[PDB]
Amino acid sequence: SSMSYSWTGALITPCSPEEEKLPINPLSNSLLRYHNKVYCTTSKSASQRAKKVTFDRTQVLDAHYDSVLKDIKLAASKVSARLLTLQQACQLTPPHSARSKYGFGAKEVRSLSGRAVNHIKSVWKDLLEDPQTPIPTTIMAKNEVFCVDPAKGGKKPARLIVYPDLGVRVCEKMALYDITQKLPQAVMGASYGFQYSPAQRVEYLLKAWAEKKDPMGFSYDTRCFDSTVTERDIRTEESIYQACSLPEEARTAIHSLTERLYVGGPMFNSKGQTCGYRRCRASGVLTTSMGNTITCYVKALAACKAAGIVAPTMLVCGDDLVVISESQGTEEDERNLRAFTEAMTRYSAPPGDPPRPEYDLELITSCSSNVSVALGPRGRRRYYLTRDPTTPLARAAWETVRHSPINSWLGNIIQYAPTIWVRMVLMTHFFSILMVQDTLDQNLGGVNPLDLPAIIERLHGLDAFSMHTYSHHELTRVASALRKLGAPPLRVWKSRARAVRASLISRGGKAAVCGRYLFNWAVKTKLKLTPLPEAR
């Protein structure tokens, strides 16, 4: 029936001309040796991305679906959302957001420049006046850094980004922003994934697992999900949106955006040319995350009913999905999972690698990440979130004339503070670098590195400075990722750490705090890390 895209064959151009690499990488050539393996996705690869996302789709629904789609509309309707004053929408605009084709950008929008406000007024009026004309969109290639994988086919192609002009982007927010803030939690409750800290996700997963008498879990994925969304799905989304208590002006505009933007439209490149036409989800629009989350939830939950999964507990973050149910023995479990996979396929949401049932929580990848366990200070099992460190290490070794990785180090040091790989590798490297630059109290991305212990204790807990006896799985995976990238093995990091520790101690003050809280693990003879005033 629907086929997701169609193409003029015009070249998908780059935004910010691709940066060449350099013959020395000074910040990272002590981190890892095999720099040849770290690459960034060229926009030449754009063509290849297209082939992988262009394909016919055919949907077929059923009682199961229809029943869910009803229950969800009942839930939508206990929700009332408001319009957003054009002004308020302008304020929500990101600072460096792509400028408008009509002579203004986010500076102007955020400051409520008169010209910017005129245009946004006229765009919005035209939404209310006209509910048919497709709104044009731009298509670009997002470049991102990765490590090469021969198994999974050398280098990945660039992701395609597709988005309307800035004017429309604001209007979108006027119409929909309050829904996006209210609806998911309404229709999905506990299952709405974004509502949780990394630490709460773990607590959630664990509570689910524990309350099954005999747990099984699995996780469902689609690398190319935006492609599987059908024009019907989108309209069924509007159907859900309108199910709320809304201003009549809202309703017209939601509907008009649906028909003119969300359902599809043409696609132009940077150089202006016509590039294609889209009949699936656009990646760059406001409702992308809300739609994906909600849609996937309907289908998934219907499929659980087709397949006969007993007592399911879900967690949904856009495309990413984890279900934790009661086992019907392994023999039935394998069948039910195939059923699910059939059902989803009929619903037009087929997967990459297909699901398999698992009976141990560590083996379930949720959100490019997963739970694992180590031992805490008093010797109790302590559970925490983690992941394959390949991409993080790859990106930690990315240096262009225009780009520095120091920020991504910090990102990961915070996010994954309790992991063995942050604690032994990234932290050791990160402080070792800044010591030598004597730039320890600079502020990177609005954080001061001498505040980490504090920041860490507040987001992760004093135990995150004391954990030991990491799992076989984690230890094997880390070992392997360092060997893969030519970083030193953990024993070498232990040394570097002892020494980075010495210096931080001798510096006194807030450095020695870092020195003692962050690097206790590295010493032969532990200190007794009491809680931190600054933390609360």
What are the domain boundaries of the chain? 1-368, 369-536
Write out the E strands in 289-358: 314-317, 320-326
Encoding tokens for residue 240? 């859900």
Structure determined via: X-ray
Asked if 209 contacts 306 with a C-beta cutoff of 8 angstroms, the reply is: no
Residues making up the annotated binding site for Mg(2+) are 221, 319-320
Resolution of this deposited model, Å: 3.0
Encoding tokens for residue 352? 């990459």
What is the Cα gyration radius of the chain? 25
DSSP H helices in 308-348: 329-346
Asked if 341 contacts 321 with a C-beta cutoff of 8 angstroms, the reply is: no
Q: How many CB atoms lie within 10 A of CB 525?
A: 5
Q: What's 203's DSSP letter?
A: H
Whole-angstrom distance, CA of residue 349 vs CA of residue 345: 5
Q: In what order do the strands lie in the sheet with 137-142?
A: 5-7, 274-278, 265-268, 137-142, 159-163
Asked if 115 contacts 108 with a C-beta cutoff of 8 angstroms, the reply is: yes
Residue the block writes with tokens 């996302």: 53
Angle between helices 114-129 and 166-188 (to 10 degrees): 60
Q: What is the 3-state secondary structure (H, E, C) of 446-486?
A: CECHHHHHHHHHHHHCHHHHCCECCCHHHHHHHHHHHHHHC
Residues making up the annotated binding site are 221, 319-320
Encoding tokens for residue 283? 């990646």
**Nearest alpha carbon to residue 187 among 229, 240, 126, 149:** 240
246 contacts: CB under 8 Å, gap ≥ 6: 80, 81, 254
Whole-angstrom distance, CA of residue 536 vs CA of residue 520: 22
